[PDB]
Design a protein around this motif. Structure first.
Motif, PDB file in Angstrom:
ATOM      1  N   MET A 148       0.410   7.671  -6.294  1.00 54.89           N
ATOM      2  CA  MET A 148      -0.249   6.888  -5.374  1.00 54.89           C
ATOM      3  C   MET A 148      -1.726   6.452  -5.491  1.00 54.89           C
ATOM      4  O   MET A 148      -2.106   5.263  -5.054  1.00 54.89           O
ATOM      5  N   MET A 201       7.242   5.637  -0.509  1.00 54.91           N
ATOM      6  CA  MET A 201       6.840   6.765  -0.478  1.00 54.91           C
ATOM      7  C   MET A 201       7.801   8.193  -0.036  1.00 54.91           C
ATOM      8  O   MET A 201       7.440   9.064  -0.633  1.00 54.91           O
ATOM      9  N   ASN A 228       0.177  12.440  -4.764  1.00 48.76           N
ATOM     10  CA  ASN A 228      -1.056  11.785  -4.748  1.00 48.76           C
ATOM     11  C   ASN A 228      -1.476  11.076  -6.079  1.00 48.76           C
ATOM     12  O   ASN A 228      -2.054  10.142  -5.906  1.00 48.76           O
ATOM     13  N   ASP A 241      -2.287   4.715  -1.976  1.00 50.33           N
ATOM     14  CA  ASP A 241      -1.728   3.768  -1.260  1.00 50.33           C
ATOM     15  C   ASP A 241      -0.103   3.302  -1.616  1.00 50.33           C
ATOM     16  O   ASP A 241      -0.142   3.370  -2.775  1.00 50.33           O
ATOM     17  N   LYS A 242       0.437   2.763  -0.896  1.00 53.05           N
ATOM     18  CA  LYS A 242       1.820   2.254  -1.183  1.00 53.05           C
ATOM     19  C   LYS A 242       1.987   1.073  -0.306  1.00 53.05           C
ATOM     20  O   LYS A 242       1.878   1.044   0.976  1.00 53.05           O
ATOM     21  N   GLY A 278      -1.571   4.876   3.401  1.00 49.12           N
ATOM     22  CA  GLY A 278      -1.900   5.889   2.188  1.00 49.12           C
ATOM     23  C   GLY A 278      -3.068   6.549   2.959  1.00 49.12           C
ATOM     24  O   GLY A 278      -2.993   6.980   4.047  1.00 49.12           O
TER      25      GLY A 278
END
Length: 266
Positions: A188, A51, A185, A210-211, A224
């Motif tokens: 992710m 990220m 965004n 999320d990651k 995230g």
């Protein structure tokens, strides 16, 4: 906050069920309500560093967004394990934007290394973190060695608190320009690797960006933002790592930690 105090107790109880460490922050961005466990301790971040990497790429592109359309004709020699997109497309190459999407949504390790190299090395990701107020994050190595997760090693670590602050700034706040924040965004939100982690612990009406990360020593992470409908975003940071070198990484502890915080906020 009595809901926060109860959640923190429940996170301590969750950690007592395994031979390892849990690092957790959940932050309600409207009120600043903040649930933390081992918030100021260092944890191996594994692929959650992707990220920060992609934020640095987006930042580098802001004055010339066409840079994201640049074709990278990488070689078969660049290919390493856990690279499901780059290995498929090595004949044609991929654009910078496509490498970012692969890295974020498929955890493509070759793509991460190509992006790190385009930026100038792992030190440039650390420098980017410093420029957005994160004095804690440190990227020392490239893939796959950044996943060693060795007990006591500070290489390739951050704290849950620092990562919470950075995720907030990047996905919700103003570390990035509006177009760059939206792109981060979008990438992710479309992650493919996290269905059993934060996504498994939230109510059905919450969207999640999320990651994930998974490394040695049973290291299993997910970071995230959850987006419930009609209230402000909630930042979630979950780091876990185990004492047994032969530990098998799990999804369920992250999902359980997430559910604790979701109950506190509802």
């Amino acid at each position: 906050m009595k809901n926060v105090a109860a959640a923190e107790r429940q996170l301590r109880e969750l950690e007592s069920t395994f031979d390892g460490r849990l690092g957790f922050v959940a932050l309600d961005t409207a009120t600043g309500a903040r649930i933390a466990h081992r918030g100021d301790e260092r944890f191996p971040f594994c692929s959650t560093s992707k990220m920060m990497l992609c934020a640095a790429v987006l930042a580098r592109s802001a004055g010339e967004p066409a840079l994201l359309q640049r074709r990278i004709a990488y070689a078969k020699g660049d290919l390493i394990r856990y690279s499901p997109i780059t290995e498929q497309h090595v004949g044609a190459g991929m654009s910078v934007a496509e490498l970012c999407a692969a890295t974020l949504q498929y955890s493509d390790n070759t793509a991460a290394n190509l992006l790190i190299a385009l930026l100038g090395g792992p030190q440039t990701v650390t420098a980017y973190a410093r420029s957005i107020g994160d004095a804690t994050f440190r990227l020392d190595r490239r893939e796959p060695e950044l996943n060693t997760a060795l007990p006591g090693d500070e290489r390739d670590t951050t704290t849950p608190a620092a990562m919470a602050a950075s995720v907030h700034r990047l996905l919700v706040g103003d570390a990035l320009g509006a177009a760059q924040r939206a792109q981060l965004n979008a990438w992710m939100l479309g992650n493919k690797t996290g269905d059993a982690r934060i996504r498994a612990g939230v109510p059905a009406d919450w969207r999640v960006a999320d990651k994930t990360g998974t490394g040695d020593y049973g290291t299993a992470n997910d970071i995230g933002v959850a987006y419930p409908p009609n209230r402000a975003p909630i930042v979630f940071i979950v780091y876990t790592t185990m004492r047994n070198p032969n530990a098998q990484a799990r999804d369920d502890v992250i999902a359980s930690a997430t559910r604790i915080a979701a109950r506190a906020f509802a």
